[model samples]
Target: ELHDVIVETRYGAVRGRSDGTVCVWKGVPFARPPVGPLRFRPPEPPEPWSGVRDATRFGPASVQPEDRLISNLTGGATLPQDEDCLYLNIWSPSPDGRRPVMVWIHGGAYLTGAGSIPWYDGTALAREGDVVVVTLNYRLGALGFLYLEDAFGPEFTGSGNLGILDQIAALRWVRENIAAFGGDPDRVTIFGESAGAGSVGVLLAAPAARGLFHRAILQSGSGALGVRTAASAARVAARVLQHAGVEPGDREALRSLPARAWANAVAALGPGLPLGPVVDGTVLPEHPMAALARGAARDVAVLVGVNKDEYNLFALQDPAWLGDDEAALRQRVEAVVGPAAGRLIEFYRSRGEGSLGRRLLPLMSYAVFVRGMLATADAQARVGAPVWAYRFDFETPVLGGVLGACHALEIPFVFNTLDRAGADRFTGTAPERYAVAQAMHRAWIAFAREGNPQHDGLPEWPRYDLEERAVMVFAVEPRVERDPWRAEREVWAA
Candidate 1:
């Protein structure tokens, strides 16, 4: 049953709902709707309201294409899409201003996904961790990431990565108003997976994001995945203008373009992708890893890791995987690992149990995800940040057990929302899986409440360093190991 719950924010009074255990406020605006004249501009603060504003339904999701492939991996978007998508949701144990705050940035390769997905409901985390949890919506695809500053001048200075600015604005709102929801504004921890995790990485390097968050957890997103160079961004900008039939300097036409035309032009480039954080030398001055190497955000604690078979999802989808011939497998491996392709194939084949598809999974995973994560942890550790590393090894029982602890599989377990709808599709409804969820969720709660992630349910997780290379392996039975991929990592390092 839902009951009225009102809280005062700097902006105004907003009404929320309570189900007895936790108080939740949904669709609370942190910025004015970015529509019409506001399109393609940096976010502005929301106008103050007079009386209580309804905070029950989730605000519309940011404008994105109807991407089925994305909807399948992440949950399908249930909310409508609009340009006015700057709302955030909150779950709090109380309104006493004492609990640590965890703000989540959802991931869909920077294209699809919103804060209202059932899987992201914060009730579990707020109750389980005794902390405040928040999830937010940011502009996606071209609406969020089209860079036109260099081509169109100062009006578009921050337009290149407005999505990142949206996140920063959300955090700013948290810093100002979270105390009203029983959250410690100073103790905020930002965490996310995939592109969301990548956003955390970018924020780590962003000058505007300094002092807004004190800790971060990057799940399956690597700081080493640097932003697009300015030259690349200009090319993408020209492509968008060319496809949309607008002049490069025509701000009025671009601003007034129909949403369908905007999407179609970007879609023609590809399906909901290739747009990401841009290195404008202003909003983001340098690569995340490069900035961390020079001690940016070194004071903030970090927990980062990748899944065991991260690339399995895509590798299974690859045209080559279906054929399963040596030449196809060798071609994919050679593209990533070069002449060491033969040695890498033999190494994975002898160590793992599976067909050529299974053997080749780690090769792709390492090339795409693992190597970058290891390098990031090492860089942050070198600068003396409290860095904890882990490898999610809980393989999914879905798809006849072929997914194999793939990308985004650890999400439900981390949020302790495995019982939510559609979770069983990826994390089969096994009682044992909940046990894994409890442990993983506890580790996250512990990390948010305290700076360290060591929970009694987990092993004595040690800090990761270039020397020891300690990592917590999460599975049916969690344990610690040193240098889990020593041989293959050495090969990749060469």
Candidate 2:
């Protein structure tokens, strides 16, 4: 089925796998692995080696705790974990064609996930789009986001947000080296889902990350959801310090501490991202929306949106939805939307949904996901910058079809890998899904290959301006509509 191929890179020649149509180099080092004393500090550029390296096996995933939801989401991918995780994978036809490069940033709430997850394999994208595909690894959780400079001081400057900085380094790596692997560095497009989307948004606003990429795609998350203020990050660091039973000023202890203590400490601070892309003056400087609205992303084209039922990924397994108890629903709903829970439920109840939790499900979806995405799209559009928005409406046929266009459900479609491995578990074995996959994959590939996603396959799609607010709704028959879910959106507006 597959053997391998050899290609020269900036570092040295490396061996990668090939299935005739696609060539893939796995675990190409992007930056020096942040380990030992290098932990929790800005990444050092990779040290070059003269000899050829075997880029066959994947580098270890970023240090993260074993998560049940994450395990299910990643199809139980049991890749090894380590702090030395700044590596990226490349898939292309060969190391010659000057094709557009589509770089991916993975999402696991900024806590879990690696670049080499089989589901995220770049072969399909490389072969189908005739473009180079990149999936990279970044430090996650406390090891990547915890602010420790209050104790570690000067040298450890952005200990709280190295994940964002790690990705910035990855882009720099792409710029300096992608041409060696058949990618056009100037045509690079950064796209991601959830936390990865969150990181893409942060990169849009990150001063150091400017010009490294030309286009941005936020799948279903935003920097608004990912930004941790100085107070929030410090609070997380203190809790992590407490959980591991270490002192604040314990310089040696913090540096050599286990990475799991960071994630395990703040996971309960769920729903709202309590971990990364802190608004430290050095890295992010200010809120990403504030930055984008101020023209930080004026030069970058953006496509941002969420799914129809994003919260169902968590709600389907939630105890609050197990029964129709109103009080239980109120508490859980209030936890995410605060006092808006009453107005949210009232609007949904007025819409006449079945169960109390069902009524609250869409509300939570808007509150947790759609609300931020709208703001992101609006900010970019406000500057009269090119922006396209969409809502993933294809419901998964799995779990009796109740997942209903859930979070991360559209990934396989985006990559056109629905027929590939690990997809059946999440996307189902229906032949009908292929059409949806083709449409989405083509749209994204078209977007990267040509600045506009308007292809023969899609209907009349328009730019999301302040007037129409047009959104491309991706479903069995993909179509364009203005303000599709106005009622649900207006519910949150009130």
Candidate 3:
């Protein structure tokens, strides 16, 4: 259906489609195409255009390998790819200004995913929260994060961080144009899961992102996963360049390479990129956690947490661990935890029963995700920033319920998109799951509207602190808990 509404932005006019309830504008470019000469460079604003641009369909997604497993979880596969993908989508209740705004950054380990995923649809959240929701796509993998500045000089100084720059550019676009979509720029909240959540943590410390967002909600992202050291990033860049058959110093040749060349080279190197923000002394002055400790984003209200069984998703992917007995599990834990491994395994064993390796999932979850989040929350709280914390304990009935509340499991709940394809596969087809989703969606919406996340549906949640470590435990029935894993935390503390 043709949209009868046109929203004017700083660059030009955009025509958005409506379904009677929410107006949606898709494929809205926020930056010049990062192709050709602009490739490997920081984002530059899109040039103004004449006439009302059609935004009924989403633009191409960033170039990345198609992962069928991920595509299944995210509820879509095979998006059209391009290096020029720097667009955003918006869903609003009306064109009238003054509603709160929430920006969502999708997660694919910073290697995959786009704003156009079916599960990320903003209509439910926008309508329920009475807020405008914006989802965006940024450069991913080598195209967005290859670090070659040391070999190529000033022209590529920010090349390793172009993806982050894309996000900042989107926020800048939101800041200047959201009002036309009925959003209050000053009341904007940035929220995401996994890599997107990690992006929020990085943005909290990024000097360029200052004052752009008022609130942040990070799900299963750790501040400790901050920018890679310049030296480490350089090594990966060397390998990537070698794979591409290009000299590191050849700036023109590197810039002239096709998008597929970069994608294939990255693919041959295998999964996961050394790609992310770099501590380049300018864009990022220090590590994100270190910067947070020094109060870089002390003024921004933060709600950060991890899932109850964060590492299970990772653990189940490799069944080799399932063959290990309790003794083997203890030894495996000891290898990482040293002498304390035995104690850690014993404490974990008391929590439940399973294969020794499987039993250690919670410990791995703590070490990898929970520890860092708690530490960062403490850092923010120490600096007098308003902070809230939660633990998503709603175990999934998927894969015979062994996945528990694994990583990214809370995404469908938070977005209130339980009806999306494959959502039932992860969340199970039960009425209670819908109730859990409703409560989660409302809490997040409440947080976007007001700095406080507590609402009538949830129990009173207190700000995180060293003394109490109060956290909302999101289960079949969400409730507040005081340091739910005190014993495990104590063991990890030592």
Candidate 4:
């Protein structure tokens, strides 16, 4: 009893284990299992339990493909996957003190990833920032995003946006119960990276999630793009059903299909994330960017950014890149930008600074990750919303220093988890990284505590605006700059 922590929630009491510095509660259910009849259904409130629930071990990860590097870099790849994975974890200094809360959503293109990752461990963040930290798992891939209304009529409505609903449910649980775990419900800040950041995009735009969080932090992802139209969602769903051997209108087959079938179906569709939120009339009536432009989240402050050379994380793994040519690169650019691919490729080539194979990495980074971030910032700024933009320029020196400011590298630094095993393989053994982590972590804490990230350790960081376009660059120096990549960015504008 002395080492265990107990707290009462709306559902029941949960007993968590302590790490001397913070009490962590893992695998806490925020919603009922989305299995059987609940598949493709909106998340329901977890049933009230009569006794204290064990919150020591992590919840099973949502079903997704396993990647060893992904596991090593971010973690949780080894966890057993299941459909009944609607859970969240929390870390608090204690159950007695109310503090700002930071909720995390992980990214794996919405297809892979879980909040149970070691890098996402909230102990250090909770102890250092004195804030309650939460990380959660949401439905992923086709099982979460597949639209079934066309296949099964009105009864199957809203299947395409179930993941978003699950997130909203988790937030609602936080609103009602986080106070029991030393968190301030009024000061909740939802933050995420990659697809998780993309999830934040939908959250900020979705009416259902409004007021659930006071502020948002988006890392290396955007709410502006990657959203699927209803038609596109239907097409993807058809492909998923086809791959799963579920005939059209085969309601029973679809309902009882293996989760792995859907995972493989979505995976067979591509190397990149192929599933995402659908722009259904109800959950997402309009594009998130369009919604933001009209001031959907004007009342909430946002801190958003992308890592410089974000594509390097994936590009460095492509064997084709090592022996590729400029012509070869143009076709690649064409995939993202279409007919203007050659023009965009040249612009990056003229201004880019890297190997021949590496020349396109910058543009790819901007296209996929950075472009939407600025767009979100631009739209939010237009509406007079409090917005701060940043670029993660902290390059890792491992692997002969090739992984330059790559995607997901800032995660450990932000969590101050560089000391975790295998972290040195990505961030290197530099002592200076500790200082970088400290500054970034502190800024994140400040942003969650207040609406702004301005702290004493950095220069006078200003809000992002049209003219000045102030951006805080998180590098070794961690300084603020005006209009980073102004020329390169202007091309996308025109």
lDDT of 1 at 233: 81
lDDT of 2 by residue, 1-494 (tens): 79878887777788888888889999889888787778877898988888778899898898876656635744665669888888899999988878999999999878888888877888888988899999999988888888876755677678777998989999998998888889999999999999999899889888899999999889989877767888777877777778776797777787666676655666645544567778878887888988987988887888888998888788655747645799888888888878777877888766646777766787778777887898888888888888999999988777777677889898888987676667778878888888888888888898898777777889988999878889999878888889876777666676
lDDT of 1 by residue, 1-494 (tens): 87999999999999999987899999999999988878988999999999999998899898777766535654655459888889999999888857999999998888778998888999999998899999999998778888888778888887878999999999999999999999999999999998898899999999999999999999998765536777888898789888998898887898889766876788888742468899888888998878988998779999999999788777444646534588888887887678878877887777766577777788888876887788778888998999999999998876677777888889999988888877877777788999999989999999999989998888799988888899999988999989997988887666
| Model 4 bad stretches (over 4 Å) | 72-77, 322-324
Per-model TM-score versus the true fold: 0.95, 0.96, 0.94, 0.97
Which is the winner by lDDT between candidate 1 and candidate 2? 1
At residue 322, give the lDDT of candidate 2: 40
What are the RMSD figures for all models against the true structure?
Answer: 2.0, 1.8, 2.3, 1.7
lDDT of candidates 1 onward, in order: 0.86, 0.83, 0.84, 0.86
lDDT of 4 by residue, 283-374 (tens): 98888888888898999999999888788777555734444487777777788889877778777777656565577777888888888998
Report the number of the highest-TM-score candidate. Answer: 4
Ranking by TM-score: 4, 2, 1, 3
| Candidate 3 lDDT trough over 10 residues, lowest sum | 315-324
Can you list the residue pairs that collide in candidate 4?
A: none
Q: On a 0 to 100 scale, what is the lDDT of residue 128 in model 1?
A: 86
lDDT of 3 at 426: 74
Candidate 4: what lDDT?
0.86
Better of 3 and 4 by lDDT: 4
How are the candidates ranked when ordered by lDDT, highest leading? 1, 4, 3, 2
